[PDB]
Design a protein around this ligand. Structure first.
Ligand SMILES: [Cl-]
Ligand SMILES: [Mg+2]
Lengths: 250, 229, 111, 231, 241, 235, 243, 240, 244
């Protein structure tokens, strides 16, 4: 046995293209649309729950994941690749930051760590790149609210608003017209729902849409009282009901 | 490095004209506590060898499993496993002797003294000793622990040198062994009355005798003894 | 504590004549005040007209003699059945002994 | 064709071509014969020279006092396998005070050769061996192929033109098996057997190599004027 | 065209070896089904013993992973057993480390994460199997979670796997469209097994004897497989109404 | 591509057979064994007249009683020489004696087939190993990258080898003197060399029981060249 | 195409062609069988006599694992030995830790997981043997057969090698004609017959018969070779049936 | 680890990776070495395709290995740095164990050994570098000049060149260098070295580097103006 | 086995070129242009972000200009993710040197170290090289202001002015035309922006498409300051120099 694939499976072609990264981006293009919008007092990330069968319970499949109490992530592309990245992202948030500094990492640095993991799958021996693009939304004390995209290559960029996957080109145009620097969080959620309706064919409700916010601190979700400086998580996943309430004012 | 915990005492043995005898009591001592009263410390290997073991019992039970595995392994791809390529006493001893010395040389000994008694292919008597240090020696009589100090003197009155072996019958040899076991019962504080005895003869093969007892004991003279002076 | 060494007593004597050599040794093997054996050979023919004894701790003695005998065997395999000269044997034994410089073979050796 | 690039690849008909190519190296090698009676076992080998200035490549290797082999194919591979045999013979003596059985020696060689035929990166051994030995069950002759197949025989031959010697031994089977307590006559039969594989060249004093092992005979090799008696 | 031999991306963004592993899944030509009751989870699978020389008791694609978890496999037996042994080892290690019994959905995730690694790392091939895990979880109740060679997994109300999965799936879909609930509203597991067998008979259009089926049942604190005679009693009840 | 340790359909190792082609391209080296000593001689073959020819070291001492000459990719020989020297000295340390010439050759040849996917390829150089011991006297061996070594009474390797070997076939007999052998090596080198033979583009050496292994001075070789020319003009 | 050049590559069918090629090596080998009886198992194998020079009864093919399991195989003989060596290590570790001798189903899975592991990577070749094995444990007799893929099942009768179709047909008759069961001594006789009948596919060269057995009554649950009078009785019974 | 045998034999007995490393040397800028009676001079080409360069900080072509030995090269620049580092370390290691600086021959042999090792080690390609190593042995006044190449062969030279158009400058040296009487002074040796580069260089401006090494660790690099004076004097004699 | 799929990233062509190095250089030639210009009283680093969007958050963004320590900075051309691996290595080498010698690392020592890393990826390991070229702008007390570049081969060289990425041929001609040795920082700023303005593939050069940085001894007295320009500050310098 032994892993005898100690050489790169991603290499430069004569034209300067890294084929395996380009093909991973193609796999991302085929994936279901997800988006992110940044407001003045929050961030929203959203996607369609494209259920593979109606017998499946799509609540059990989580496309929008908590990474830290103040950071969340959504994807487009290959689901399994996303799941293992979420596991590695949560662990690296502790091992390379919380266990050292006694606090959760800021958004940009966690993103950077996830980006590093994806870059190494682009250069290390005997592996293919991750077939996903991530959108990571988060808050921290000194940088405030932020939104980042991460691609298969490991490259990451900050956004005011963006989309990835299937109908990203049309969605990004829709967001350019609507976005401004004076949006409140509710206005951003409203725009996210409008934008996401264009790329959804079938049913459009709280059971077929997954949507989460990075907003105010939620002391009700903390699980314990008695420490004034611990005020709870800023990440919150909206319920099926909460989505349907905003679809009547649509 | 360890310390022995549960221990077995003397193993005694001698050669006679046609074979070898070996014996050892059925006690497992836990310090001065005589904890386990039914321990077999003679372990036969095939029909031509008996390995007598004293010292730490857990290390004995490990050696017991090694011999059991040795029989299995010899049988593999061996059409003559019950004939010309069967295990000899000399093979079994040398294996153990190797192990014991390797184990001492890693500073983690098997805390035992062992006597391998048997008869070879050509009818020759085999009797050899090995201990936790890997020291080995052979003699017309051999004994471990207290047996070395008390049994050997008595057994050497029967077979004092090599030339006395053909002159010693199995009846004379067994008698001498049985008396020695009684003497050890009188005088070794970590012994028991019950014991096992094995005979390996070139004609009659392996005879294994369990549940023997020390008998014909002299205690009557105790009644006359009164005080300390 | 476990003591890996022991003393099996005995005494050995080597004398070199003009065209011969003798290596003698008693046959008694002991521990403390007990006799283990009255006849336990201690001087060994090792092939190539070389005799050897390693007196002291009999387990280390036996181990060393056994390894030298084996060294004679492999010398024949590796060098076209060449006879191992007494001086060459001596130097080989030095390396066997010094190989365990920090866990010595507890023996006085004569060939 | 497409399935001979390495030893890890079966052909569509279930063949291992790299092993078959290693088998071919034996056929190119010089002829050697093995035969035995109930008391003794003999090796006879035709040694090959490079030219008239060169020496004749040695074909027989001693493994112990009671065992050894003759080779045909890559000589460095025979050195590797014989060195392994020497060690296993030696391990048996040191640990168990026991001479290694000839049958068990074959089994060990088989298993060593097999590992090289199932793993990537390695290569099969490029040599065939004839092992003779006298142990606790009498005389024995083995044939080793680098596929892994080891076979116990009364007699055989391997190398170039070996089929001629092998037919002779098949005819002579009932005669040479009975040659007990006569080493000279058993060797004569082996020399006559190897003669059936010669063409153009004949058996000279530095050409012929003979080895014998038996009841009260350690494994010894005869070369030079020690084989002029049998020419 | 070596992008079809190992798990690397094709120009279309596809992994052909994953797709071909899915095809290996149906090589046994066996269909499986799983459904949830109130207090139980039931899994049934076709059993086919083509050779008369086979000992039919040793022919099984249902595995008892832990006391609580059962697993049915669609795919060749060597890969099925590979997956089984690993799932058993993982379930045991979990209990030792964290002090409570491994949940069905967590094991599924774990096996799915292992499967994912085979799609990203080149030296490991995917296993050509679909693993359907079943239990009555102490927190979530009756549970069905299914893993595939892509590393995908999800919870199910009910599910079906095999060559004729689409027919069984649609049959089940239609039933749950009528009842408007996420399970079989039945007290006893015996009747939930009867439901499963009945709806497989309807979907496939074939009749079953006692040796044509293989049944597993999860209840609180134990999973167990039914004998031929336990199934026979089940088939008798179906035929008598 | 294909394995480095692959067998050809004929039953030869590809990489070994290809290394033998590299050795054919190498400069000529010749050895001749006699009862008075063994002589080793090489073609230096300097690529340009600015190259200081005395820095071309194609004859090398292994021990006092063993010398060595090389042909082929001569850079590959350095590690082989190092091993040989170590083996010779190590054996002297363990056994308080000189090492047999055959045993030294065998120790070098054990390296040869240690290649795969150890080193990445076989050696691209052949060696003539010449020496003396008490058991088998004056000896000459030919060590290949196949791991095989043949003993020779005389041998030539390199580019002019088959032509030279035919010449050695006719000229060698068992009663040759050391002086006769020296001239014979010079004669055959001159025959197969492209350039004209002199003391600066050819080198001689020998090994005798008394004096051991000696590389010949350019002045000493120049006299033996002049002695050769006169004896060939003598008939 | 190219899917058959490397081990562990799925073709577009969902097939590992290298494993299927390993099967061809098995089909090329000599016939070997297994028969489950009332209180044990019987193994038998066809040994082709290539030459008069082969020493009779010496080149033993059937192998023992532990003291209670027999293994026989067809195909590449060295591969079979490598698998049995692994089996002996597995059975030794099992007994070391758990005290009791390894049960036959447990042992079957140990071999099965090992052979399956040689279909997971391109750096290894699949096994070129189908192995028939079994013995007696605490739950009674068991007979298994294990293919190059790692697939194994329990059997009433099993057969593999060049004369497998012939043998299988004969085994199928025994299963039908004895639903109550076959005795150990009967199985030895029938094993001899079936090998003789399966020798029509290898009719060019003559052969040597080899038989072994585990039986609770006849061998005390231990693996033993059929020798001497009992072997000759089974040869005579087999020779009578072909004529 | 990566174990792939990159340097291997071909049917005709050639190791192509070694031969292709020589082609990288052919592409590299020209280097030349000329030893006089009591000095050695190393000349090096600087291609003038790169202006706007900072010549203060740009890696110089000639490198000191110790205070008494220097190394110039032709071929891959990144590869040369690895050989130079190993050489400098081995030079100090020799001082630490033998209590004496390296001989020029020893240092050469070491570097040549490293280059060789890379032609029969798994997972590595040969160095695309040939070197000229020059200097004086400790307490010795005889000049030393050696050459190495990717294959690992080394040898001593009265004068030698490597790199692009080295065929032309070797032609020049083969007719202009006399062994019976080498350049007797520093001036003569530098002049002959500058002349040999002017056959190939283009402009004699910032395209020629010269480094003079003399006995007892006396190494100095000539400046632009000092070299420019040699360029001037050569062409004024040529106009005749 | 595995050999079948090996690209062999570390081999010579028949011509004596490193395939993967060459193809990596081709990759870099499509990256956004980065320029470095060295003056007597400081160094300028300018770099063009690639075809941006109106929804990209520019003030928190950094794809081109990175800080290695207080005295050294780099401009990146090529794969941003690859650069960040090398940048974090270089940041550690600088702090290792500081811990050991209690002095800031000299600019060339840092550059050699990084370049030696890149070299290793071309000679051994069988991995693809890093698709990155760096412009190093830095200061130390030995050589003063220094500009270097390194590319995937691991070769590095020193410069007075230099470009990497797209249109380097055109960019280097324009710099070679207008550069002078007695130039000052304020002039070099203007040259860098004028050069990008002519060599850009975009229709016009605006503040949102640029990253800009200076290393000045314009820091109160005998010390050095690194200024990474803010979006508003780039907008101001574009109006000042007369480009918008
Ligand atoms: Cl996991
Ligand atoms: Mg894979």
């Amino acid at each position: 046995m032994t892993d005898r694939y100690s050489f790169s499976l991603t290499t430069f072609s004569p034209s300067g293209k890294l084929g395996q990264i380009d093909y991973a981006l193609t796999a991302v293009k085929q994936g279901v649309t997800s988006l992110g919008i940044k407001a003045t007092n929050g961030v929203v990330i959203a996607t369609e729950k494209k259920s593979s069968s109606p017998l499946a319970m799509s609540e059990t499949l989580s496309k929008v994941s908590l990474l830290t109490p103040d950071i969340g992530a959504v994807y487009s592309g290959m689901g399994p690749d996303y799941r293992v990245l979420v596991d590695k992202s949560r662990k690296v948030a502790h091992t390379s930051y919380k266990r050292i500094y006694g606090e959760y990492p800021p958004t940009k640095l966690l993103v950077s760590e996830v980006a590093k993991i994806m870059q190494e799958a682009t250069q290390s021996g005997g592996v293919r790149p991750f077939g996903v693009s991530l959108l990571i939304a988060g808050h921290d004390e000194f940088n405030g609210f932020s939104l980042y995209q991460v691609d298969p290559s490991g490259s990451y960029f900050p956004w005011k608003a963006t989309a990835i996957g299937k109908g990203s080109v049309a969605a990004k145009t829709f967001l350019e017209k609507r976005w401004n620097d004076e949006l409140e969080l509710e206005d951003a959620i409203h725009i996210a729902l409008l934008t996401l309706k264009e790329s959804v064919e079938g049913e459009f409700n709280g059971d077929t849409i997954e949507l989460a916010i990075i907003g105010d601190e939620n002391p009700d979700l903390l699980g314990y009282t008695g420490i004034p400086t611990d005020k709870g998580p800023r990440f919150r996943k909206l319920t099926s009901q909460e989505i349907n309430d905003r679809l009547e004012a649509l | 490095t360890q310390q022995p915990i549960v221990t077995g005492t003397s193993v005694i043995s001698m050669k006679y004209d046609n074979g070898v005898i070996i014996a050892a009591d059925n006690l497992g001592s836990y310090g001065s506590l005589l904890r386990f009263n039914g321990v077999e410390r003679l372990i036969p290997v095939g029909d031509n060898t008996v390995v007598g073991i004293s010292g730490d019992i857990s290390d004995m039970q490990h050696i017991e499993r090694l011999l059991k595995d040795l029989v299995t392994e010899n049988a593999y791809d061996n059409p003559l496993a019950d004939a010309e390529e069967a295990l000899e006493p000399s093979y079994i001893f040398e294996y153990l002797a190797t192990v014991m010395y390797q184990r001492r040389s890693k500073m983690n000994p098997l805390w035992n003294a062992i006597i391998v008694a048997g008869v070879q292919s050509n009818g020759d008597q085999f009797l050899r000793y090995v201990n936790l240090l890997g020291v080995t020696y052979s003699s017309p009589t051999l004994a471990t622990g207290f047996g070395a100090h008390m049994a050997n003197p008595l057994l050497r009155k029967v077979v004092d040198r090599e030339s006395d072996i053909p002159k010693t019958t199995v009846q004379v040899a067994e008698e001498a062994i049985v008396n020695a076991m009684r003497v050890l019962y009188y005088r070794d504080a970590r012994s028991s009355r019950n014991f096992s005895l094995a005979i390996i003869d070139k004609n009659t093969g392996l005879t294994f005798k369990k549940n023997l007892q020390v008998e014909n004991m002299k205690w009557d003279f105790a009644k006359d003894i009164k005080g300390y002076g | 504590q476990f003591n890996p060494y022991g003393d099996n007593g005995g005494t050995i004597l080597g004398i070199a004549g003009e065209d011969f050599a003798v290596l003698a040794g008693d046959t008694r093997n002991i521990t403390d005040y007990s006799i283990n054996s009255r006849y336990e050979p201690k001087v060994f023919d090792c092939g190539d007209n070389i005799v050897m004894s390693a007196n002291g701790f009999a387990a280390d003695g036996d181990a060393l003699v056994k390894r030298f005998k084996n060294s004679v065997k492999w010398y024949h395999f590796d060098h076209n059945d060449k006879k191992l000269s007494i001086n060459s044997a001596a130097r080989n034994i030095q390396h066997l002994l010094y190989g365990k410089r920090f866990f010595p073979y507890y023996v006085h050796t004569i060939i | 064709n497409n399935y001979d690039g390495d030893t890890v690849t079966f052909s569509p008909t279930g063949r291992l071509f790299q092993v078959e190519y290693a088998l071919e190296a034996i056929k190119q090698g010089s002829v050697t014969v093995g035969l035995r009676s109930n008391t003794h076992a003999v090796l006879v080998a035709l040694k090959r020279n490079a030219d008239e200035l060169s020496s004749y490549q040695k074909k027989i290797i001693k493994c112990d006092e009671h065992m050894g082999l003759s080779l045909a194919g890559l000589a460095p591979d025979a050195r590797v396998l014989s060195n392994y045999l020497r060690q296993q013979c030696n391990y048996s003596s040191l640990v168990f005070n026991r001479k290694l059985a000839v049958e068990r020696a074959g089994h060990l060689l088989c298993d060593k050769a097999q590992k090289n035929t199932q793993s990537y990166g390695g290569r099969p051994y490029g040599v065939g061996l004839l092992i003779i030995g006298y142990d606790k069950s009498g005389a024995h002759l083995l044939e080793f192929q680098p596929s892994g197949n080891v076979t116990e025989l009364y007699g055989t031959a391997i190398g170039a033109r070996s089929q001629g010697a092998k037919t002779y031994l098949e005819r002579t089977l009932d005669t040479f098996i009975k040659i007990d307590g006569n080493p000279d006559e058993l060797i004569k039969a082996g020399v006559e057997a190897i003669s059936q594989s010669l063409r153009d060249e004949s058996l000279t004093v530095d050409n012929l190599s003979i080895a014998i092992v038996g009841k009260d005979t350690p494994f010894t090799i005869y070369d030079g004027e020690a084989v002029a008696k049998y020419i | 065209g070596y992008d079809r031999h190992i798990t690397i991306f094709s120009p279309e963004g596809r992994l052909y070896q994953v797709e071909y592993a899915f095809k290996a899944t149906n090589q046994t030509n066996i269909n499986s089904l799983a459904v949830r009751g109130k207090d139980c989870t039931v899994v049934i699978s076709q059993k086919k013993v083509p050779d008369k020389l086979l000992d039919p008791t040793t022919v099984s694609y249902i595995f008892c992973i832990s006391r609580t978890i059962g697993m049915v496999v669609n795919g060749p037996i060597p890969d099925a057993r590979n997956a089984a042994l690993r799932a058993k080892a993982e379930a045991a290690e979990f209990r030792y480390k964290y002090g409570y019994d491994m949940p069905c959905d967590v094991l599924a995730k774990r096996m799915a994460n292992l499967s994912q690694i085979y799609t990203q790392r080149a030296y490991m091939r995917p296993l050509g199997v679909i693993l359907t895990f079943v239990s009555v979880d102490e927190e979530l109740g009756p549970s069905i979670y299914k893993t595939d060679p892509a590393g995908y997994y999800v919870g199910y109300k009910a599910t079906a796997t095999g060559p004729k999965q689409q027919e069984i799936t649609t049959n089940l879909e239609n039933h749950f469209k009528k009842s408007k609930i996420d399970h079989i509203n039945e007290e006893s597991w015996e009747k939930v097994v009867e439901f499963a067998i009945t709806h497989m008979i309807d979907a496939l259009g074939t009749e079953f004897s006692k040796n044509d089926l293989e049944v597993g049942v999860a209840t609180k604190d134990k999973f167990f497989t039914l004998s031929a005679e336990n199934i026979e009693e089940r088939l008798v009840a179906i035929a008598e109404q | 591509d294909r394995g480095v340790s692959t067998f050809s359909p004929e039953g030869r190792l590809f990489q070994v057979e290809y290394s033998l082609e590299a050795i054919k391209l190498g400069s000529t080296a010749i050895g001749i064994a006699t009862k008075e000593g063994v002589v080793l001689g090489v073609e230096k073959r300097a690529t340009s007249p600015l190259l200081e020819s005395d820095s071309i070291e194609k004859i090398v001492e292994i021990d006092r009683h063993i010398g060595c000459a090389m042909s082929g990719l001569t850079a590959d020989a350095r590690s082989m020489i190092e091993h040989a020297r170590t083996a010779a000295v190590t054996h002297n340390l363990y056994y308080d004696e000189d090492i047999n010439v055959e045993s030294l050759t065998q120790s070098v040849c054990d390296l040869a087939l240690r290649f795969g996917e150890l080193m990445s390829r076989p050696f691209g150089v052949a060696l003539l190993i010449a020496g003396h011991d008490a058991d088998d006297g004056y000896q000459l061996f030919h060590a290949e990258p196949s791991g095989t070594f043949y003993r020779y009474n005389a041998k030539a390797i390199g580019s002019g080898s088959e032509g030279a070997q035919a010449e050695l076939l006719n000229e060698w007999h068992s009663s040759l003197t050391l002086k006769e052998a020296e001239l014979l090596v010079l004669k055959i080198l001159k025959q197969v060399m492209e350039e004209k033979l002199d003391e600066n583009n050819a080198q001689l050496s020998c090994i005798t029981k008394q004096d051991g292994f000696k590389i010949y001075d350019n002045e000493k070789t120049a006299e033996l060249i002049k002695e050769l020319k006169e004896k060939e003009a003598a008939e | 195409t190219g899917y058959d050049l490397s081990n562990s590559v799925f073709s577009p069918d969902g097939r590992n062609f290298q494993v299927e090629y390993a099967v061809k090596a098995v089909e090329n080998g000599t016939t070997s069988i297994g028969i489950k009886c009332n209180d044990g198992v019987v193994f038998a194998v066809e040994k082709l006599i290539t030459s008069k020079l082969l020493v009779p009864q010496k080149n033993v093919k059937i192998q023992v694992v532990d003291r209670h399991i027999g293994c026989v195989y067809s195909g590449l003989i060295p591969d079979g030995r490598h698998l049995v060596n692994r089996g002996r290590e597995e059975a030794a570790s099992f007994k070391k830790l758990y005290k009791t001798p390894i049960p036959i189903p447990a042992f079957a899975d140990r071999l099965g997981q090992y052979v399956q592991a040689h279909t997971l990577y391109n750096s290894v070749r699949p096994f070129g043997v189908s192995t028939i094995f079994g013995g007696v444990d605490k739950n009674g007799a068991h007979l298994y057969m294990l293919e190059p893929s790692g697939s194994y099942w329990g059997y009433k009768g099993a057969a593999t090698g060049k004369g497998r179709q012939s043998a299988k047909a004969e085994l199928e008759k025994l299963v039908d004609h004895h639903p109550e069961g076959l005795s150990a001594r009967e199985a030895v006789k029938q094993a001899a017959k079936i090998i003789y009948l399966a020798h029509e596919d290898n009719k060019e060269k003559d052969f040597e018969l080899e038989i072994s057995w585990c039986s609770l009554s006849e061998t005390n649950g231990l693996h033993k070779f059929v020798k001497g009078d009992l072997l000759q009785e089974a040869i005579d019974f087999a020779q009578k049936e072909i004529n | 680890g990566y174990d792939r045998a990159l340097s291997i034999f071909s049917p005709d007995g050639h190791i192509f990776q070694v031969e292709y490393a020589l082609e990288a040397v052919k592409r590299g800028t020209c280097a030349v070495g000329v030893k006089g009676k009591n000095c050695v001079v190393l000349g090096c080409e600087r291609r003038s395709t790169l202006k706007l360069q900072d010549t203060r900080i740009t890696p110089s072509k000639v490198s000191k290995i110790d205070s008494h030995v220097v190394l110039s090269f032709s071929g891959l620049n990144a590869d040369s740095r690895i050989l130079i580092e190993k050489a400098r370390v081995e030079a100090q290691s020799h001082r630490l164990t033998l209590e004496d600086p390296v001989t020029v021959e020893y240092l050469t042999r070491y570097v040549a050994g490293v280059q060789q090792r890379y032609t029969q080690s798994g997972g590595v390609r040969p160095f695309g570098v040939s070197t000229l190593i020059a200097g004086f042995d400790p307490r010795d006044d005889e000049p030393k000049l050696y050459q190495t190449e990717p294959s690992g062969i080394y040898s001593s030279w009265s004068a030698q060149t490597i790199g692009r158009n080295s065929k032309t400058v070797r032609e020049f040296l083969e007719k202009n260098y006399d062994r019976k009487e080498p350049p007797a002074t520093v001036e003569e040796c530098v002049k002959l070295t500058v002349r040999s580069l002017l056959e190939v260089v283009q402009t004699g401006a910032k395209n020629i580097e010269i480094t003079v090494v003399k006995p007892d660790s006396d190494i100095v690099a000539l400046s632009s103006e000092e070299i420019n004076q040699y360029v001037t004097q050569i062409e004024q004699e040529k106009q005749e | 086995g595995s050999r079948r799929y090996d690209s062999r990233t570390t081999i010579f062509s028949p011509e004596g070129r490193l395939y993967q190095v060459e193809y990596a250089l081709e990759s870099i030639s499509h990256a956004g242009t980065a320029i470095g210009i060295m003056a007597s009283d400081g160094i300028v680093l300018a770099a063009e972000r690639k075809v941006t969007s109106t929804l990209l958050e520019q003030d928190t963004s950094t794809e081109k200009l990175y800080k290695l320590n207080d005295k050294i900075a780099v401009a990146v051309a090529g794969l941003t993710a690859d650069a960040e691996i090398l940048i974090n290595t270089a940041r550690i080498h600088a702090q290792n040197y500081l811990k050991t010698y209690n002095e800031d690392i000299p600019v060339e020592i840092l550059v050699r170290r990084l370049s030696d890393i890149k070299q290793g990826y071309t000679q051994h390991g069988g991995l693809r090289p890093f698709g990155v070229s760096f412009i190093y702008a830095g200061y130390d007390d030995r050589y003063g202001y220094q500009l270097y570049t390194s590319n995937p081969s691991g070769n590095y060289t020193g410069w007075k002015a230099i470009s990497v990425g797209a249109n380097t041929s055109a960019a280097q001609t324009l710099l070679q035309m207008d550069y002078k040795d007695d130039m000052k920082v304020d002039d070099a700023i203007e040259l860098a922006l004028k050069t990008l303005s002519k060599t850009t593939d975009s229709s016009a050069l605006t503040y949102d498409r640029l990253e800009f940085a200076t290393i000045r001894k314009g820091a109160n007295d005998g010390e050095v300051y690194q200024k990474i320009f803010k979006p508003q500050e780039i907008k101001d310098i574009l109006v000042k120099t007369g480009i918008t």
